[PDB]
Design an enzyme around this catalytic site. Structure first.
Site, PDB file in Angstrom:
ATOM      1  CE  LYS A  15      -3.891  -1.886   2.672  1.00 49.87           C
ATOM      2  NZ  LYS A  15      -4.651  -1.730   3.935  1.00 49.87           N
ATOM      3  N   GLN A 117      -2.955   7.760   7.537  1.00 52.88           N
ATOM      4  CA  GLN A 117      -3.666   8.748   6.726  1.00 52.88           C
ATOM      5  C   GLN A 117      -4.901   9.291   7.454  1.00 52.88           C
ATOM      6  N   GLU A 182     -11.276   3.574  -5.467  1.00 57.91           N
ATOM      7  CA  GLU A 182     -12.588   3.881  -4.870  1.00 57.91           C
ATOM      8  C   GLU A 182     -12.589   5.334  -4.367  1.00 57.91           C
ATOM      9  N   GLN A 189      -6.949   4.701  -1.953  1.00 64.23           N
ATOM     10  CA  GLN A 189      -6.210   3.555  -2.516  1.00 64.23           C
ATOM     11  C   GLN A 189      -6.417   3.225  -4.000  1.00 64.23           C
ATOM     12  N   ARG A 191      -5.446   0.049  -7.292  1.00 61.70           N
ATOM     13  CA  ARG A 191      -5.021  -1.268  -7.757  1.00 61.70           C
ATOM     14  C   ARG A 191      -5.648  -1.625  -9.104  1.00 61.70           C
ATOM     15  CD  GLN A 216     -13.918 -26.429 -34.809  1.00 65.59           C
ATOM     16  OE1 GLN A 216     -12.810 -26.276 -34.293  1.00 65.59           O
ATOM     17  NE2 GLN A 216     -14.164 -27.372 -35.712  1.00 65.59           N
ATOM     18  CE1 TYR A 231      -5.803 -26.768 -32.790  1.00 63.02           C
ATOM     19  CE2 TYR A 231      -5.984 -24.719 -34.007  1.00 63.02           C
ATOM     20  CZ  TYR A 231      -6.508 -25.935 -33.629  1.00 63.02           C
ATOM     21  OH  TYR A 231      -7.743 -26.319 -34.092  1.00 63.02           O
ATOM     22  CG  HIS A 691     -13.148 -33.526 -31.673  1.00 65.84           C
ATOM     23  ND1 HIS A 691     -13.111 -34.318 -32.800  1.00 65.84           N
ATOM     24  CD2 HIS A 691     -12.018 -32.779 -31.698  1.00 65.84           C
ATOM     25  CE1 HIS A 691     -12.006 -34.062 -33.479  1.00 65.84           C
ATOM     26  NE2 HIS A 691     -11.326 -33.134 -32.832  1.00 65.84           N
TER      27      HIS A 691
HETATM   28  C1  LIG Z   1     -15.264 -19.130 -37.846  1.00 63.75           C
HETATM   29  C2  LIG Z   1     -14.628 -20.239 -37.111  1.00 63.75           C
HETATM   30  O1  LIG Z   1     -13.303 -20.227 -37.385  1.00 63.75           O
HETATM   31  C3  LIG Z   1     -12.375 -21.325 -37.342  1.00 63.75           C
HETATM   32  C4  LIG Z   1     -12.029 -21.974 -36.078  1.00 63.75           C
HETATM   33  C5  LIG Z   1     -12.684 -21.525 -34.763  1.00 63.75           C
HETATM   34  C6  LIG Z   1     -11.083 -23.054 -36.022  1.00 63.75           C
HETATM   35  O2  LIG Z   1     -10.740 -23.670 -34.694  1.00 63.75           O
HETATM   36  C7  LIG Z   1     -10.455 -23.554 -37.230  1.00 63.75           C
HETATM   37  C8  LIG Z   1      -9.456 -24.701 -37.216  1.00 63.75           C
HETATM   38  O3  LIG Z   1      -9.122 -25.310 -35.917  1.00 63.75           O
HETATM   39  C9  LIG Z   1      -8.897 -25.163 -38.423  1.00 63.75           C
HETATM   40  C10 LIG Z   1      -9.218 -24.555 -39.665  1.00 63.75           C
HETATM   41  C11 LIG Z   1      -8.520 -25.092 -40.945  1.00 63.75           C
HETATM   42  N1  LIG Z   1      -9.697 -24.958 -42.019  1.00 63.75           N
HETATM   43  N2  LIG Z   1      -9.029 -24.757 -43.292  1.00 63.75           N
HETATM   44  C12 LIG Z   1      -9.430 -23.503 -43.854  1.00 63.75           C
HETATM   45  C13 LIG Z   1      -8.730 -23.242 -45.192  1.00 63.75           C
HETATM   46  N3  LIG Z   1      -8.039 -24.386 -45.725  1.00 63.75           N
HETATM   47  C14 LIG Z   1      -7.722 -24.177 -47.142  1.00 63.75           C
HETATM   48  C15 LIG Z   1      -8.690 -25.662 -45.545  1.00 63.75           C
HETATM   49  C16 LIG Z   1      -9.376 -25.825 -44.189  1.00 63.75           C
HETATM   50  C17 LIG Z   1     -10.087 -23.435 -39.758  1.00 63.75           C
HETATM   51  C18 LIG Z   1     -10.754 -22.922 -38.541  1.00 63.75           C
HETATM   52  C19 LIG Z   1     -11.744 -21.756 -38.607  1.00 63.75           C
HETATM   53  C20 LIG Z   1     -12.456 -21.660 -39.984  1.00 63.75           C
HETATM   54  O4  LIG Z   1     -11.734 -20.845 -40.863  1.00 63.75           O
HETATM   55  O5  LIG Z   1     -13.795 -21.160 -39.799  1.00 63.75           O
HETATM   56  C21 LIG Z   1     -14.788 -22.168 -39.823  1.00 63.75           C
HETATM   57  C22 LIG Z   1     -14.595 -23.355 -39.138  1.00 63.75           C
HETATM   58  C23 LIG Z   1     -15.687 -24.458 -39.166  1.00 63.75           C
HETATM   59  O6  LIG Z   1     -15.764 -25.099 -37.929  1.00 63.75           O
HETATM   60  C24 LIG Z   1     -17.048 -25.157 -37.405  1.00 63.75           C
HETATM   61  C25 LIG Z   1     -15.410 -25.498 -40.251  1.00 63.75           C
HETATM   62  C26 LIG Z   1     -14.527 -24.923 -41.358  1.00 63.75           C
HETATM   63  C27 LIG Z   1     -14.802 -26.735 -39.678  1.00 63.75           C
HETATM   64  O7  LIG Z   1     -15.502 -27.846 -40.157  1.00 63.75           O
HETATM   65  C28 LIG Z   1     -16.894 -27.635 -40.247  1.00 63.75           C
HETATM   66  C29 LIG Z   1     -17.327 -27.641 -41.706  1.00 63.75           C
HETATM   67  O8  LIG Z   1     -17.569 -28.639 -39.547  1.00 63.75           O
HETATM   68  C30 LIG Z   1     -13.293 -26.793 -40.022  1.00 63.75           C
HETATM   69  C31 LIG Z   1     -12.545 -26.161 -38.917  1.00 63.75           C
HETATM   70  C32 LIG Z   1     -12.772 -28.215 -40.230  1.00 63.75           C
HETATM   71  O9  LIG Z   1     -13.264 -28.763 -41.429  1.00 63.75           O
HETATM   72  C33 LIG Z   1     -13.087 -29.141 -39.055  1.00 63.75           C
HETATM   73  C34 LIG Z   1     -13.671 -30.448 -39.571  1.00 63.75           C
HETATM   74  C35 LIG Z   1     -11.817 -29.443 -38.259  1.00 63.75           C
HETATM   75  O10 LIG Z   1     -11.925 -30.681 -37.617  1.00 63.75           O
HETATM   76  P1  LIG Z   1     -11.424 -30.794 -36.083  1.00 63.75           P
HETATM   77  O11 LIG Z   1     -10.740 -29.495 -35.672  1.00 63.75           O
HETATM   78  O12 LIG Z   1     -10.452 -31.947 -35.967  1.00 63.75           O
HETATM   79  O13 LIG Z   1     -12.600 -31.036 -35.176  1.00 63.75           O
HETATM   80  C36 LIG Z   1     -10.571 -29.481 -39.180  1.00 63.75           C
HETATM   81  C37 LIG Z   1     -10.432 -30.850 -39.794  1.00 63.75           C
HETATM   82  C38 LIG Z   1      -9.390 -29.217 -38.287  1.00 63.75           C
HETATM   83  C39 LIG Z   1      -8.052 -29.392 -38.705  1.00 63.75           C
HETATM   84  C40 LIG Z   1      -6.955 -29.076 -37.659  1.00 63.75           C
HETATM   85  C41 LIG Z   1      -6.032 -27.876 -38.039  1.00 63.75           C
HETATM   86  C42 LIG Z   1      -4.898 -27.823 -37.090  1.00 63.75           C
HETATM   87  C43 LIG Z   1      -6.686 -26.557 -38.043  1.00 63.75           C
HETATM   88  O14 LIG Z   1      -6.122 -25.594 -37.698  1.00 63.75           O
HETATM   89  N4  LIG Z   1      -8.003 -26.270 -38.395  1.00 63.75           N
END
Ligand SMILES: CCOc1c(C)c(O)c2c(O)c3c(CNN4CCN(C)CC4)cc2c1[C@H](O)O/C=C/[C@H](OC)[C@@H](C)[C@@H](O[C@@H](C)O)[C@@H](C)[C@H](O)[C@@H](C)[C@@H](OP(=O)(O)O)[C@H](C)/C=C/C[C@H](C)C(=O)N3
Ligand SMILES: [Cl-]
Length: 733
Positions: A15, A117, A182, A189, A191, A216, A231, A691
């Protein structure tokens, strides 16, 4: 050490400086280790090193008994003279006694000091960001007021309060952080606010809108920097990180409108709460900038070959990474991520994934308008072949089938807490057979775990002990060969459903054209919907191979005296860790800060939507003729069941009996082995084809996802009824 020093005189107790920086007071009101000699007293304290709480009894009675040597009081009164002694005594001693009982309640023999104070009068409190939604621009004061900037949104039981809003935002800039001071306008004081959910550091022009990856991906756990990095280095999406979790920027897609209407509507069909949230953001005037006035289906051999192609890619990677070390290792991972992206985003693979998804949508839409049956693709998906995640759950039953006849092994597993229990089984009768069963199961699914997308989380094969309670439950809840019986039964129901649909359709106008076209979709559905879970499986496989290699590098950094703990690579991003290995230098004030941030990230919960103003938005369901007092969610697996709710946040502690309905935050693939005994599923996040949801259908398990605060609204042990067709939940008891 200075005996005493007034507020401005101090330079860089806690403080003691709320005062510190604040002495500046621009445009507002500013006001205004002496126990070192505390050292009978010393004898007691070394007794505390050793219950006997009587101690505070004299340590704290002497406090009142602490006689202040004037050795300095005049100094004390040689300072407050410009601005009594009996008073200083009561509390000075009062404050010291403070050291006595609390510490005991909750340690270092170091000390806290006293601040003096003056009392005045005229009050509520000032919040720089609102507590309700965490909007950095809107502010609220407590009787409470909500102002954005010189405009007040709501008035709830008045021109000078607005003058005030402008005082906080001034001193906010002096620390940069949104703060809690506040005022009763005289502030004692100060924070910072530590509960706000972080905004993605993205300095691209204007207001932005982010989509929660956690929802998702069916995983809300905070991820460590290194895991977040891998990722981000995999996704082709404009993704960022905030609060130890991932978010996707879709602001540019919302600027045009056919881009917007293709984004809003599409996301609405994964889960309606996204769309409702997006439409709310759009309806927020002044925020979002003004709009200005058939896939190909692969062969039957494609899925078999896509899996084969992926397996051999892993196999090659496994051989190549063994001979790599230091900078070479990092050079290799960078160019292997391209191979990861190739297998994961193969145009043919995507077509195979969508083949099942499109067929599900086709059936669920057409069969409903024809026969009136809603979501028939659920039952038609039951016991689909070649689903690596579905197989994982059922094959753990087979593992339990091996262990069941062995009493000696079971007595051990029920009580053991040894992580290395795998090498203690040969002693027991049937342990050798049990070890084999576990090793074979872990050779297929060991690379998976809860939070597998985070490369830095403990895998099953690294800590097999976490699978034990599921195995034990299988022994207790099932007879032998439950895997074959459950799967075979699923095939029957799915085929009986197929024949029923095709039969009924031929009674409609233009019968044997609606049926034949439906039969084609069912075949496609059951042939591709299983592959849906595999690209994830192939990606995780590469991640674990990465992890093992990065751990070796981390252990080398320990040997070289650079790192202290080899798992401290988890709090470095890939970009940063590569430099540590290359140069040999590392900033640990950074690493400690990363660990400190992660600890606060775990106490955060990702919103479905996050804006640039830190505003957290979750969608709202529309109660159309659904029961009142029903907890609404997203139906992803048809059926209605009544059972005992089980609110379980960690799978390892899941003591699931027959008839239980699993209520939890998320169900990523690793949760599947807990689906075998339950008769219903409820999750807080997830979507239509994410999933867990895809697995519940194949298991014939009624599931409702997207249920907000389900782990808080529903109490463990309560009898509930969920409806996986309409998507609601009822409490009975
Ligand atoms: C508007 C939402 O935006 C997203 C979001 C939130 C994401 O988390 C996206 C995402 O994780 C990915 C990706 C990778 N997608 N690319 C986009 C461009 N590429 C040329 C090919 C595929 C995108 C994410 C996005 C996306 O831009 O926005 C929409 C996402 C939808 O999810 C509800 C949709 C496209 C989804 O599938 C739908 C149709 O059911 C996409 C993500 C995939 O086809 C899923 C099937 C996903 O499967 P899963 O994560 O294992 O359950 C795919 C196969 C994932 C691949 C893993 C990879 C490492 C990756 O990065 N993928
Ligand atoms: Cl033990």
């Amino acid at each position: 050490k200075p005996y005493v020093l007034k507020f401005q005189e101090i330079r860089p107790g806690g403080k003691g400086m709320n005062l510190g920086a604040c002495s500046n007071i621009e445009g507002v009101h500013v006001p205004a280790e002496a126990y070192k000699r505390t050292l009978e007293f010393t004898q007691l304290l070394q007794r505390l090193s050793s219950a006997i709480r009587e101690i505070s009894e004299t340590i704290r009675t002497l406090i009142q008994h602490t006689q202040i040597p004037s050795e300095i009081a005049s100094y004390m009164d040689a300072t407050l003279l410009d601005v009594g002694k009996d008073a200083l005594l009561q509390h000075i001693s009062m404050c010291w006694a403070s050291l006595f009982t609390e510490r005991a309640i909750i340690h270092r023999k170091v000390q806290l000091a006293v601040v003096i104070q003056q009392m005045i009068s005229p009050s509520g409190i000032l919040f720089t960001a609102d507590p309700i939604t965490s909007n950095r621009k809107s502010l609220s004061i407590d009787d409470s007021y909500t102002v954005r900037e010189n405009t007040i949104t709501n008035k709830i039981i008045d021109q000078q309060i607005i003058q005030l809003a402008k005082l906080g935002r001034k001193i906010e800039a002096y620390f940069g952080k949104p703060q809690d001071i506040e005022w009763c306008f005289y502030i004692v004081q100060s924070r910072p606010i530590t509960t706000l959910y972080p905004i993605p550091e993205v300095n691209e022009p204007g207001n932005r809108v982010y989509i929660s990856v956690a929802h998702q991906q069916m995983m809300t756990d905070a991820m460590k920097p290194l895991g977040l990095s891998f990722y981000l280095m995999t996704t082709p999406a404009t993704m960022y990180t905030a609060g130890g979790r991932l978010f996707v920027d879709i602001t540019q897609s919302l600027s045009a409108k056919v881009s917007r209407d293709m984004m809003v509507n599409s996301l609405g069909q994964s889960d309606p709460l996204i769309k409702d949230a997006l439409l709310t953001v759009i309806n927020k005037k002044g925020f979002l900038p003004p709009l200005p006035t058939v896939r190909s289906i692969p062969d039957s051999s494609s899925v078999f070959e896509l899996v084969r192609n992926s397996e051999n890619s892993i196999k090659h990677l496994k051989q190549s990474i063994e001979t790599k070390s230091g900078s070479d290792l990092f050079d290799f991972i960078v160019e292997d991520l391209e191979e990861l992206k190739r297998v994961l985003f193969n145009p043919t693979s995507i077509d195979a994934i969508m083949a099942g998804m499109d067929a599900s949508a086709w059936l669920n839409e057409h069969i409903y308008q024809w026969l009136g049956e809603k979501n028939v693709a659920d039952k038609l998906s039951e016991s689909a072949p070649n689903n690596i995640t579905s197989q994982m759950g059922l094959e753990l039953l087979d593992v339990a089938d091996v262990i069941r006849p062995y009493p000696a092994v079971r007595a051990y597993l029920e009580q053991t807490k040894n992580p290395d229990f795998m090498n203690e089984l040969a002693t027991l009768e049937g342990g050798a057979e049990t070890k084999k069963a576990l090793e074979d199961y872990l050779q297929k699914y060991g690379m998976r775990c809860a939070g597998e997308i985070d490369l830095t989380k403990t895998r099953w094969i690294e800590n097999p002990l976490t699978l034990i309670p599921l195995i034990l439950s299988n022994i207790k809840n099932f007879d032998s060969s439950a895997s074959m019986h459950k799967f075979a039964q699923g095939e029957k129901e799915a085929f009986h459903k197929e024949q029923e649909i095709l039969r009924r359709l031929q009674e409609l106008p233009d019968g044997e054209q609606k049926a034949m076209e439906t039969k084609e979709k069912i075949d496609i559905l059951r042939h591709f919907i299983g592959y849906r879970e595999y690209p994830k499986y192939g990606m995780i496989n590469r991640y674990f191979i990465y992890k093992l290699a990065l751990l070796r590098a981390g252990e080398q950094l320990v040997k070289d005296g650079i790192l202290q703990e080899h798992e401290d690579i988890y709090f470095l991003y890939f970009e940063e860790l590569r430099e540590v290995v290359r140069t040999g230098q590392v900033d640990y004030e950074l690493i400690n800060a990363r660990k400190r941030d992660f600890a606060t990230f775990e106490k955060l919960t990702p919103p479905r939507i996050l804006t640039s103003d830190g505003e957290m938005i979750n969608g709202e369901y529309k109660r159309e003729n659904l029961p009142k007092d029903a907890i609404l969610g997203l139906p992803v697996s048809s059926g209605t069941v009544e059972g005992r709710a089980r609110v379980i946040l960690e799978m390892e502690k899941a003591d699931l009996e027959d008839g239980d309905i699993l209520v939890t935050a998320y169900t990523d693939p690793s949760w599947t082995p807990a689906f075998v005994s339950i008769k219903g599923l409820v999750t807080e996040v997830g979507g239509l084809m994410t999933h867990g949801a895809v697995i519940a259908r194949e298991y014939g398990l009624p599931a409702v996802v997207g249920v907000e605060n389900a782990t808080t609204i529903i109490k463990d042990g309560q009898q509930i009824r969920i409806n996986g067709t309409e998507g609601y939940i009822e409490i009975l008891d």
